[PDB]
Structure formats: structure tokens, C-alpha cells
Design an enzyme around this catalytic site. Sequence first.
Site, short mmCIF file in Angstrom:
data_model
loop_
_atom_site.label_atom_id
_atom_site.label_comp_id
_atom_site.label_asym_id
_atom_site.label_seq_id
_atom_site.Cartn_x
_atom_site.Cartn_y
_atom_site.Cartn_z
N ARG D 54 0.82 -1.17 0.00
CA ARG D 54 0.21 0.04 -0.03
C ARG D 54 0.74 1.27 0.00
NH1 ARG D 54 -2.91 -4.23 1.97
NH2 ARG D 54 -0.76 -4.44 2.19
N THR D 55 1.78 1.50 0.93
CA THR D 55 2.50 2.67 0.95
C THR D 55 3.35 3.03 0.02
OG1 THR D 55 2.61 2.12 3.45
CG2 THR D 55 3.85 4.14 2.68
N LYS D 84 27.76 -3.41 -1.71
CA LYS D 84 29.20 -2.96 -1.50
C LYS D 84 29.46 -2.29 -0.25
CE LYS D 84 29.31 -1.76 -6.35
NZ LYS D 84 29.55 -1.00 -7.60
N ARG D 105 10.97 4.13 3.41
CA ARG D 105 10.79 3.06 4.71
C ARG D 105 11.90 2.23 4.76
NH1 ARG D 105 5.45 -0.69 4.64
NH2 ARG D 105 4.43 1.34 5.24
N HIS D 134 4.56 6.39 11.50
CA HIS D 134 4.20 6.06 10.20
C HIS D 134 3.23 7.12 9.92
CE1 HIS D 134 2.71 4.18 6.46
NE2 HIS D 134 2.72 3.16 7.06
O1 LIG Z 1 32.00 0.30 -7.36
C1 LIG Z 1 32.78 1.12 -7.27
O2 LIG Z 1 33.62 1.20 -6.09
C2 LIG Z 1 33.06 2.16 -8.25
C3 LIG Z 1 31.95 2.34 -9.06
N1 LIG Z 1 30.75 2.93 -8.66
C4 LIG Z 1 29.52 3.54 -9.12
O3 LIG Z 1 29.45 3.35 -10.31
C5 LIG Z 1 28.62 3.86 -8.04
P1 LIG Z 1 27.22 2.91 -8.11
O4 LIG Z 1 27.70 1.57 -8.03
O5 LIG Z 1 26.36 3.08 -6.86
O6 LIG Z 1 26.44 3.02 -9.37
C6 LIG Z 1 31.75 1.09 -10.04
O7 LIG Z 1 32.66 0.56 -10.72
O8 LIG Z 1 30.65 0.43 -9.83
O1 LIG Z 2 2.27 -3.54 8.45
C1 LIG Z 2 1.40 -3.19 9.27
O2 LIG Z 2 0.76 -3.97 9.84
C2 LIG Z 2 0.83 -1.80 9.24
C3 LIG Z 2 1.65 -0.85 8.32
N1 LIG Z 2 1.04 -1.31 7.10
C4 LIG Z 2 1.39 -0.44 5.94
O3 LIG Z 2 1.80 0.65 5.93
C5 LIG Z 2 0.89 -0.99 4.65
P1 LIG Z 2 2.02 -1.54 3.52
O4 LIG Z 2 3.01 -2.44 4.20
O5 LIG Z 2 1.53 -2.44 2.33
O6 LIG Z 2 2.89 -0.54 2.80
C6 LIG Z 2 3.02 -0.82 8.51
O7 LIG Z 2 3.50 -0.27 9.49
O8 LIG Z 2 3.72 -1.10 7.67
#
Ligand SMILES: O=C(O)C[C@H](NC(=O)CP(=O)(O)O)C(=O)O
Ligand SMILES: O=C(O)C[C@H](NC(=O)CP(=O)(O)O)C(=O)O
Lengths: 147, 147, 310, 310, 310
Positions: D54-55, D84, D105, D134
Site C-alpha cells: 500500500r504505502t 558494497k 521506509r 508512520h
Molecule cells: O563500485 C565502485 O567502487 C566504483 C564504481 N561505482 C559506481 O559506479 C557507483 P554505483 O555502484 O552506486 O552506481 C563502480 O565501478 O561500480
Molecule cells: O504492516 C502493518 O501491519 C501496518 C503498516 N502497514 C502498511 O503501511 C501497509 P504496506 O506495508 O502494504 O505499505 C506498516 O507499519 O507497515
Amino acid sequence: LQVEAIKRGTVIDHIPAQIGFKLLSLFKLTETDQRITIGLNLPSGEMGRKDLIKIENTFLSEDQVDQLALYAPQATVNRIDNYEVVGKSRPSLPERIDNVLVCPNSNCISHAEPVSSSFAVRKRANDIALKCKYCEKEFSHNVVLAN
Amino acid sequence: LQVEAIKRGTVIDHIPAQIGFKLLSLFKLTETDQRITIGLNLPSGEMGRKDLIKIENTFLSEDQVDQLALYAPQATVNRIDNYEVVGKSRPSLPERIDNVLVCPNSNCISHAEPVSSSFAVRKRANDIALKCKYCEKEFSHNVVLAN
Amino acid sequence: ANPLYQKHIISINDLSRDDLNLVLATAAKLKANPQPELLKHKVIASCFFEASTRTRLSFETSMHRLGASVVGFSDSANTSLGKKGETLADTISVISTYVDAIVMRHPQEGAARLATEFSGNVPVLNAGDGSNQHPTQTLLDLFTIQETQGRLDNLHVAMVGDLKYGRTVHSLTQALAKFDGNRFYFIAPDALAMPQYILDMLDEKGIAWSLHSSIEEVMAEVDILYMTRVQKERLDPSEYANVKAQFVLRASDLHNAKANMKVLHPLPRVDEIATDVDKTPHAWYFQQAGNGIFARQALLALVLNRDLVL
Amino acid sequence: ANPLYQKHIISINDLSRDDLNLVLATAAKLKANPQPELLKHKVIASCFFEASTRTRLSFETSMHRLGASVVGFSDSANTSLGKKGETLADTISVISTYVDAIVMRHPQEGAARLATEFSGNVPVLNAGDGSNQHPTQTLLDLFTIQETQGRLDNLHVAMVGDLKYGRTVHSLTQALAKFDGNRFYFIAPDALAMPQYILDMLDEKGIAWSLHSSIEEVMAEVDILYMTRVQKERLDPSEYANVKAQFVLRASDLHNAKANMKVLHPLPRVDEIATDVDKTPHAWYFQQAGNGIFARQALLALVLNRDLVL
Amino acid sequence: ANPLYQKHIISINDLSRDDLNLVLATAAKLKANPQPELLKHKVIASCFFEASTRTRLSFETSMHRLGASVVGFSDSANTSLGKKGETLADTISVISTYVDAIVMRHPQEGAARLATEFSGNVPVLNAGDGSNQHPTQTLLDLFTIQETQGRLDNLHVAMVGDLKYGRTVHSLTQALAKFDGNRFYFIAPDALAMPQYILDMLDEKGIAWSLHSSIEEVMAEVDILYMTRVQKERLDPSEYANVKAQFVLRASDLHNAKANMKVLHPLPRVDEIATDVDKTPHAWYFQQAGNGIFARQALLALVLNRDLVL
Ligand SMILES: O=C(O)C[C@H](NC(=O)CP(=O)(O)O)C(=O)O
Ligand SMILES: O=C(O)C[C@H](NC(=O)CP(=O)(O)O)C(=O)O
Ligand SMILES: Nc1ccn([C@@H]2O[C@H](COP(=O)(O)OP(=O)(O)OP(=O)(O)O)[C@@H](O)[C@H]2O)c(=O)n1
Ligand SMILES: Nc1ccn([C@@H]2O[C@H](COP(=O)(O)OP(=O)(O)OP(=O)(O)O)[C@@H](O)[C@H]2O)c(=O)n1
Ligand SMILES: O=c1ccn([C@@H]2O[C@H](COP(=O)(O)OP(=O)(O)OP(=O)(O)O)[C@@H](O)[C@H]2O)c(=O)[nH]1
Ligand SMILES: O=c1ccn([C@@H]2O[C@H](COP(=O)(O)OP(=O)(O)OP(=O)(O)O)[C@@H](O)[C@H]2O)c(=O)[nH]1
Ligand SMILES: O=C(O)C[C@H](NC(=O)CP(=O)(O)O)C(=O)O
Ligand SMILES: [Mg+2]
Ligand SMILES: [Mg+2]
Ligand SMILES: [Zn+2]
Ligand SMILES: [Zn+2]
């Protein structure tokens, strides 16, 4: 004096600077109801700067005095009675250190089991080497941590 | 006076028994070259027994003084200059405490991540309430002090 | 009583040259003249908390050749330590109310020593404790070296492979260092070097030793080439570059070997000794393993029987 | 600008009654008269580090209904944090250079609060942080109560089930306590009671609340019956006796309900609401879910626009 | 059409200096004056077969900022390649019947090149192929260096950490070598050194490079300090001694840096950059990441539009 005389107990004099606190922590010397007086960074004619620990109505065996050798090899342990110095002794390097240290070998049986730690002590070069009773590995005292 | 008067610095008086040594740890007070004198398990008029710490040419940081309110509400912090008390006060509870405390909520994000701990402080008459900035949970300071 | 009667056998460091010689003398005797009922009415625990083929099976065979009975386990998974959370201390405290001796192997260093603190009057025999000690391996090794070289003094001994984690070479080096004029060659990758406490012990005794980066350097002068397996189950993940044997002995490496030279290996081998070595006259690792019966019979006799066998 | 422009939305504790009414008034307007281009040229991150139906889906649908674009992830397993070793802090630090708002979340309490410290000028909207808060659930809950009851004051509200770990009821109780004369009924196992910090807040404000061991005790007087799921993914193993729903609402239990009473549940339900409840006029959990669209559009519109004129 | 119209973007080795300058000039224009509808009616596949935070999210954000739509996946586990045994070849063959461009990251070197052989007229943009190339990282890196240094010539550049498996530094070194008088400092463990094919290229072009065992040696002379993460998911187990960062940059290490020096890191960092560096004026890895938006918009605009007039 800045730290007054006591009637009865033990005065550990001539502790090197920065070691006084280490001794209190390691040997749990403050875990008592007896009166303790401590001076840190006191001037000395013999050592320059020194720490000092006084513990009333408390006495140290030769073995306990020897345990200090690793941290304050040139300390003086004064046994006081009726305000009088009735005994002076200097720490001698002990044969072993029990309880207070932790073996740095992570695969040693001592970590998992209800036994007390124990290391044999020897002089190696200009260092102190510690050999674990259990695992028989040997370490520089520098890398053997406390509890 | 077993531990005598000083010229300039700080005297923390009326520290409860078995707390003085803990203060020396937490505030790294012995990590200095300044002269320090400590009385543990001293008789006291209002307390019966107490600990006492003197640090020359040294003063506490703020909130390190308000950390004191948690560990020793009844303690007296004396500011001393030219052999005279010129500042005398008991540390009052601060609103907020940062960095030193650990949230007891194990699922708090503050454990896993590089942020400083932070708690809001209020009194519930029989204990102190500490509220985590992050998880918003509230605890007795009795429980937070198990860092 | 004989000097080893009711003694714990934990570390070669606790034993003297006289102790070692006594075991070997006793081993020679029982081999020549078996005593099938010497340990009749003994019950002995065989407690293995990590893997073994040779050590456990030869110890148990030895117990039976001497008339003793055996109880124990080859796996800790189905003991109460394995499933109910029991300490090793409590395990030893109860087993020592049952048996006349405890043989134990364990993956943590110091386990055997610990057992002696809870076993009361019941002797503990260390069949290997982590990467620390392996005294009965050393006893059979010494027996084998003596058999094939005619002496235990003035030998040239090379040790190859994982010297850091080999409980075998820790014990064996300490033992041979109790004899006179032996010379050591250590051939290991730097990450698995012989530990400093062993080397310091050699230096105090004035014993010659040197490091070498190849078997060939020393092949012409060695009397005993003692090969070892890389102890992969002991390696830190940061030592994983050394999993594969760095020194592989094969039949063609033995051309300039002395006629008397024997290749030993406490086993198991992976590839550090090629199978083509097996049929050459220098291969003695299987003969070595069979000698475990004589050494272990000897040790059991000496620990559990008051008088000297003759 | 409106009071919520560019504000983080982390905890109901940081919001006033006026803030809540503003979202509700804006929600009613958008429901009545949609604004398909209100967030044109906005790109919003939807970052879910734990499960959601839902959320996440209503949030993203809401973004699209207002004309914004969406990037993000519903699983952290294929982020650089998952593979990583990247911290949440760094994750927020880079994502906040890309987008105009972050919806997040996370399974740890406080994660949303922590994000605000690394997101600079980018507002963070807490879609749920562990068992803590929440806020947007509370927004749609309030909206639904307002719609069905005509008011947010002088209500009789029962909350049933896992109140300890229900981030839904923590936020909802705090919100309803900002209004006047509301009365609360807490029906929960002892192990999963409404936490003391909630109760203390109710006491400080002079709001009547009471505990009850059955729905039946209060059925005849409640305007809102708010059911919750046992948060089993949050339970300590010591609390596993509470995994099954202790209170099970069936159609037959509604016989003495007020005609206007509505049964709410933030969802998902396991067994705490039987399916025979679905067809009764009191069941309103699906209508409630549907209202997530209008509350979340309202919140997005107010945070990312200075002014709205209907 | 512009020189990059409908071109595959696989390896820096296929790009000229003029190509790189064109992207950088286009990036600066888009940053200064956005074009929200430049790629209207384009649909682009974002296909990530290994983890990403920055590269995927900035790429997709970039597509949305230019008005394009996005389809794809961040995990291969629920594609028919993940569950039904489909080859990458066939995967590219069908996806290229749907979309106007394919952005792909893949754990095997060469995957992007292979895709171009099955994608027909559909351009492929390499978001990273194993430890080989990472062209768009280099584009944003160059952009960031240009921004902070005012130039791409006569720079002193240090690259630190895992240079063997760093696809980031393979692409970046090749790019900077297309400019004049750049000087390189390689600070890496021996096991993870900059590969010989890179060094040979530097030699053939008469470009000065040198190895150093510490950052301190070169701190006073570098304009750009480019830190990298140990690519542990690429390490052979034999290389596991190198898992922990060998070089750890702390705020205190910057004391003798040039005032204009910037610390870059393609990210994520583990421990090679301490968090106390973040607040220093030299830290620029988050600004660098943010620049991924402008480089990637620029690249997309040039590949999918014949002409751009600012
Ligand atoms: O992972 C690294 O250390 C350097 C380099 N990092 C990134 O491209 C950033 P990302 O993995 O968050 O897209 C890579 O080669 O994937
Ligand atoms: O999970 C529950 O029981 C209540 C509450 N539920 C929701 O937010 C609905 P959902 O997890 O499908 O996004 C929560 O705290 O995550
Ligand atoms: N009633 C007493 C008597 C002695 N001391 C302490 O015991 C230590 C040593 O005693 P003493 O022999 O009197 O001093 P020194 O002659 O200086 O001893 P040394 O030459 O070994 O330093 C001094 O720190 C002194 O303050 C004490 O605390 N209480
Ligand atoms: N030059 C000084 C002055 C005072 N003190 C110490 O500072 C503390 C408090 O100072 P003071 O007001 O002089 O003692 P009290 O009158 O007893 O104060 P209180 O009412 O707090 O007990 C005492 O422990 C005293 O020993 C000191 O060590 N050095
Ligand atoms: O019991 C003591 C001993 C010493 N002190 C303090 O320590 C300093 C030295 O006082 P001492 O008189 O005890 O030192 P010393 O001359 O004997 O020289 P050493 O043996 O230590 O080398 C002085 O500052 C004194 O006030 C105490 O306060 N209490
Ligand atoms: O600076 C000091 C203060 C106190 N003391 C020692 O502490 C003990 C108490 O002496 P105090 O004089 O300090 O206690 P008090 O009358 O002020 O009463 P309270 O404030 O503690 O309630 C005495 O035994 C004295 O030797 C010192 O040694 N040094
Ligand atoms: O395992 C080795 O390589 C040497 C040595 N081997 C043995 O004792 C033979 P086993 O493990 O079959 O009893 C050991 O330390 O366990
Ligand atoms: Mg003196
Ligand atoms: Mg007083
Ligand atoms: Zn040990
Ligand atoms: Zn917390």
C-alpha cells in the site's frame, strides 16, 4: 605533603607517570570500602614526575607486589603500620600473570571456557614476552590486552 | 585534610562512593600532565562517605559538567583561583545529552550509522527519562547507563 | 612407577629427551613382542572434536592390540556439547568419571591443557589441539627417523610447507631440538613461516637453522625431508593466497638426494607430494603412518601401566 | 509559503493540529478536483528498505497523478548499500543530489530522522521507520475518520492488537490527542501493550484511555475500531507466544455496534479480521487504503509547492 | 548530426578528446539551462545485472529530467535470463525491439560490447562491465575536474586503492591521457596495481607516471586525489589479503595539500575515506556524484538527438 600520611596500609610510591591510573584500572584497586588517596603527576627528585597510591588497611603479598613489575618496575611498596614504614619492597618480574590479561589468539580455548587467563613471563630482547598457558603462542606484552 | 588545598583548578566534591573512579575514566581526567589528587571513600558530613577529585590549572567543559548531573547530581563543582573558591555550584540537569550515551534500543539506527547519539532529558520524580533523538523511545537513565 | 605413569601428554615442550627415548624404547619392545593383554580392564575415551583418519584409527587400534576397550566419538555434533550447549570443561568433568584415560583432538589451541584441569586423576593425551601441539605425531615421527637414519642426533632436517599452522612441526622441531647437533631447513611461504617462539628456542640452544625458498637448494644435504599440508581450515581469509601448495615434490626432484634420505609427511597430502614419489625408495610416509601403532601402543602402556615393559 | 513547504515529515510529534487539518483540507480538494500537472518537472525518490504494498504503490501512484517522475527501489539488495557496504548516510548524501524529495521506509527506528541530516535541502517523508512512526498512514487514517465520522473530536476509538510495535497506532494516537475530548480503548496482549511514552502523553493532556481484554466490552460505544496485525518481523523470539492474533473480529461480533461505526485496519491483515466482515457496512479498510491516494497527493503537493489555490 | 548521434558508448578507448569535450560542453549548458522535453517520446531501458545506487538512479533521473520514459530492471533474478535460462544475446535481441537506447551494467567484462552486436540500430551505453570500463563515470569525473581545476591539461592526478579492478580508473586514465601534460601517481597494493595495458598506453604517449607507497609522498603536489574502493566482489580468493583498505585518508592527512586540491571517489566508500574528511574544503565526492546528472543528461541528449542548440 599534598597527600597526607596514613596510619596503616600500603603506599605504592615511585609509580611512573601515566601508570598510576592504569594500575587502579587493571588491578581493580578502587573496588573496596577502604580509604584510598591518590596523587598523579607529582614531582620527584629521583624520577622527575611520579604517581602515588595509598590504600588503607590493605596489604600486598610479594606475588601481588610482583604483578606491578610489568607496569612500574622501579616502584616502591611501603607497608605502613602505626604511621610507620615497617617494610619496603621493590617489584620483581613474576613468573606469570593470571586473570587480568586476555589472550590475543582468537582461536585459544581460554575465550570460550570457564578458565582464568594465564601467561608465562620472560624477558625477550628489551621486551617482555608472554606465553599463553593454553595455546602456547607467545606475544609481546604490548599486544596482550586487559579485560 | 588528607588531600590538601590547591592554588588554581577544579575540585569536584560530594561525589558518591564508587563513582569517583568512574568519573576519572569517562572524562579522561588523568590524561594530562596537570597535578591531580584523589580521595576515595572519604568520610562526609552530609553523605557519610564520598569521593573527591582535584585537578590543578584545569576546568571542566560545559555539559561534561552537565554529564555530571547524571552520574552524581549531589556533587559540588568548585572553581578555585589564588587558593580561593570563586565558583561553587551543583550541576543541573541539561535538556540534551550528546555523544557519550548509547541508545538501549538495539534496533535504533544510531548503532549502525556514523551519527552522534543524542537524548532529551526530563525528570519523572523517581528516575530520569532519556529520549533518543532518532528512535524517539524513552528510557530510565538507569537503563541508558549500561552503554 | 615409570616416569610417564599417569602423566598428561599435552606438549613436547613439557617432555624431556629421556621421556622421548623411553617411548621409543618401549615401542621397539612391543613391536618385537606384543602384549595383547597389557591394558586388559582399561576403558579409554577416544574424543575427536575435529576430523582424523590416522590419529584416531591408529590410537584405537593400539588400544585394542593392548586389550583395552574404547568409547567416544569422532564428531562432536551429537554430544551434549554439540547440541545442548555444554562446555568442554563439563564434558571432561563427566567423561573423567568413566574412563582410565582420555585421548582428545580439538580445533581450539589449548583444549587438551584445559581438559587436564577438569580430568582429576585421569590422564589426557593430546591428539592435536588447533595449530598448537601434536605430541603423538612427534613420537611416531621420531620413531620413523630413528628407524631409517639409525640416530636422532646430528641430522639435517628440512621442513616444508605450512610451518605456521602445522602442529606437527611445532612439536617435532621442539623434540629434535632436545637432541644434539641437528640442523634445520625451513621452506615455507613468508605468510606461513615457522613461529618465532620455535626459532627463539633454537637460538637459545645454539642450534643452526636457515630459511630457503626451494627444496633443490638443500636436497643434496638433507637426511629427512618432512613435507606438510597447508592447514587450510586454520587459515585466516587474508592468508588464502597460500591455500595451494607452494612446493610440490616429484620423483625427478630426488636425483641428487642422499641414498639414506627419507621423505616423510604426517599426512594427509594434497598435491605437495606427487604420486610418482610413492614408488621411489625415498618415500616413507606410509611406513611412517604404520609406525603410529608402535608409538601409540608404547605411550598407552607407559601412561596406564605402572611398570616398565621389557 | 504554506506551513509544510519544504518540511521533512518524520514524526506526528513534530506536527501541529493545524498542520494535520491543512493536509486533510488539501486532500479533500484534490479528491474533488484533481491537479494532474501540480508536480510536473519534479523527480521523487521512492526508497523502500523493507516490504510494502500500500504505502509504496499509493505513494508512487500519487506522484504520477500530480505529474511527477519517480526513481528508487523496493529492495535494498541491489543498491550499493546492499552489495558494497555503503552506509545509509552516504546513500542519502548522493540520492539527495538527484531528486526533489525522498520517500523512505526502513526497518530501523530513526532511519528517516537520520536521513534528514544528510539530505540538505531535500525533504524526507517517513514511509515507516521500524516500529517508531508512520506519519502518512496517520494522515490517511485521520482523513478516513473525518470522512466517515464528520469530526476528529469527541470520538470513541478502540485500537486492537500489537500496539507495542504498531508504528501505525503510535502516530495515530499522537495525532488524535491533538484534538479535543477523544477517548481511547486499548485492547492488546500484555506483552504488546501500548508503550508508556504514548500513555504518559495522554495523561499529560488529560485524555481518558483504558485497557480492555475484549472487543465485546467496548463494541457498543466505539466510533472507530482500529485493528492491527501482529508485527512478527519485529518480535523478539521471547515474544513468539504472541504471533497468532489474540483478537479475531468476525461479522457476528458487530451485532451491537453503533450504525456509524467503521472498522479500520492499516493492512495487511492476517487473521485478526475474518473475511465475513468484508461485506458488512462497518468494513472500511479498503476504502481507507484508497484514501492513501488523496492524503499522499496532499502531502506531496504541500511540501513541494509554496502555494496551492484549490 | 553531432558526432555522438546514435553511437554506442562502450569504452573510453573508442572516444576522442573532441568527443569528451563535446559531452562536457553539453553538460555545462544543460546544467545552466535545462531542457525538460528534449527526449520526449523516447523510452530507454535501464538494465542493471549487478548492484548500483549512483549510476542507475542518476541515469534514470537524467532520463526523466529530459522527459524520456524508463523501463528495465535492477536485478536480473526475475528476468527470463534469471529464471528460464535465456542468454544475454537473446535478451538484448528482444529488448532492442522495444526501446530507443539501452543502458546496461553487467558483472562480466565485455557484456556491453556483446550487446552492441545484437541491438541493431539501438545504441548501448555501458554503465559498467565487470572490471573493464565505466565510460559515464569518466564523463562525470572529467566534468568535475574541469569544474574545480579549470582545465584537463597539466594536472597532477593521484589514483589510490584498487587500480587493477577499478573500471573507474581504467576509463579515467585513458581519458586524461587524451589531454596534454597530465602527470599520474599510482598508489596501490602490488596485488592490485594499475594493469600493464594502461601503463603501456601512457608510455606510448610519453606521459609521466610513477608508483608510490603512500599518499603523503604526493599530497603536496596533487590537484586531484582520486580514491577508490577495493573491488571485493571481483577479487580472486588468492587476493583476499587486500580486502581491507590499505590507504586510509583522514582530515589530518590534508595539512600540506594545495588549497585547490579536490578529493574525488566514484563511490561507495567503505573505510578508505574517513568521515572527518567530509567537512574539509577538499572533499568533493558528493558534488562529483551530483555531477552525474549533467554528464548523463548530456550523453543521452547527444546520442538520441541529431542536433542540440544549447
Ligand atoms: O563500485 C565502485 O567502487 C566504483 C564504481 N561505482 C559506481 O559506479 C557507483 P554505483 O555502484 O552506486 O552506481 C563502480 O565501478 O561500480
Ligand atoms: O504492516 C502493518 O501491519 C501496518 C503498516 N502497514 C502498511 O503501511 C501497509 P504496506 O506495508 O502494504 O505499505 C506498516 O507499519 O507497515
Ligand atoms: N604514615 C605514613 C608514612 C609514610 N608514608 C609514605 O610512604 C612513602 C615512603 O616512606 P618513607 O620511607 O618515609 O619516605 P622515603 O624515605 O622517601 O622512602 P624512599 O626513599 O623509598 O622514597 C612516602 O611516599 C610517604 O609519604 C605514608 O603515606 N604514610
Ligand atoms: N584552595 C582550596 C579551597 C578549597 N578546597 C576544597 O574545595 C572544597 C569546597 O570548598 P569549601 O567551600 O572551602 O569547603 P566547604 O565550606 O565545606 O564547602 P561545601 O559546603 O560544599 O561542603 C573542599 O573540599 C575543600 O577541601 C581546596 O581543595 N582548595
Ligand atoms: O606521601 C606523600 C609523598 C609525596 N607527596 C608529594 O610528592 C612530592 C614528593 O614528596 P616526597 O618527600 O615523598 O618525595 P621524595 O623527596 O622522597 O623523593 P622521591 O622518593 O619521590 O623520588 C611532594 O610534592 C609531596 O607533596 C605527597 O603528597 N604524599
Ligand atoms: O579537600 C579535602 C576535603 C576533605 N577531605 C577529607 O574529607 C573528610 C571530610 O572533611 P570535610 O570538611 O571536607 O567535610 P565537611 O565537613 O565539609 O562535610 P561534607 O561537605 O563532606 O558533607 C575529612 O576526613 C577530610 O580528611 C580532604 O582530605 N581533603
Ligand atoms: O592435518 C595435517 O596436515 C597433519 C596432521 N595429520 C594427522 O594427524 C593425520 P589425521 O588427521 O588423519 O589423524 C594433523 O595435524 O592433524
Ligand atoms: Mg622518597
Ligand atoms: Mg564541606
Ligand atoms: Zn591463548
Ligand atoms: Zn534510539
